[PDB]
């Protein structure tokens, strides 16, 4: 979930 | 008779899901379809010749090149089946259709973001590669307009992008067009009345409610009425003349709602709250 702005 | 399909994505359980849902905008009824075989988030979907395609994504372990397909028959109780896989694993790719073929561009394989785009013909069940984009991009939507393909914004692994690229079938090469005013990754994209709308996303510090529209006839961008809430990793599709922004992540919560942009009123209306809560799901439109 390390996509910019994605949920933790 | 067009309905909305929402597939996969990242669920309230905080993991990828396999839920497939249909939303009928006339009756405002939701219903479940058969679940996809592998749970996938960061996933793309398209409809083509009354078949639904679920493309790539991320199952919580790997980025995927595999592809699932569902025949949208009128007798219900159907089964997803696996078809030819992409040449390259892509989470957070953009996908669209042009003629008899799916086009899929950009994305992330777990190591690199892709410059490459590739296309699929269901009659030969094979994927083939096309020109590389100038900038590698994930989170960049793909829209075909008047035979030309556009790949808008995204994330190259360092910067969120406002740049926009177009694919010229005469040359098979990508070139830049006028960039957007805001840089966005994970925004929804769709073509409506000769305009490419980009809804929401994330600009590197804020989840966005804002919307801009690219006038293809004048290579220029203008500001459109803002959405009712910020939505990141939001799918967007058009249906009987109105633009739909589908679920997403508002920066704090996963959303179960769909808001509809009606150009007659030039504003956004939440039209349903009863979907599954999710983001980076695949969305597409079916006729029934
Ligand atoms: Na399951």
What distinguishing features does this structure have?
heterodimer; A: 8 residues; 0% helix; 0% strand; flat; B: 288 residues; Neuraminidase; four-stranded antiparallel β-sheet; binds sodium ion
Can you describe what's shown?
The complex is a heterodimer of chains A (8) and B (288). By secondary structure, chain A is largely without helices or strands. The radius of gyration of chain A is 4 Å and the shape is flat. With 288 residues, chain B is an all-beta fold. Chain B has a single domain, classed as 6 Propeller (Neuraminidase). In chain B, the strands form 7 sheets. In chain B, strands 4-3-1-26 form a 4-stranded antiparallel β-sheet, with no helix packed on it. In chain B, strands 5-6-7-8 form a 4-stranded antiparallel β-sheet, with no helix packed on it. The PDB classes it as ligase. Keywords: E3 ligase, protein binding, peptide binding, Kelch-like protein, kelch like family member 12., ligase. The assembly is dimeric. The entry is titled "Crystal structure of the kelch domain of human KLHL12 in complex with PEF1 peptide".
CATH topology call of chain B: Neuraminidase
Physical arrangement of strands within the biggest beta sheet of chain B: 4-3-1-26
CATH architecture of chain B: 6 Propeller
Distance between the termini of chain B: 5 Å
Query: What is the domain total for the residues of chain B?
Result: 1
Order of helices and strands of chain B: EEEEEEEEEEEEEEEEEEEEEEEEEE
What share of residues are in beta strands of chain B? over 45%
User: Which two chains share the most extensive interface?
Assistant: A-B, 6 and 22 residues
Count of DSSP E strands of chain B?
26
What oligomeric state do the depicted chains represent? heterodimer
Specify the number of helices of chain A. 0
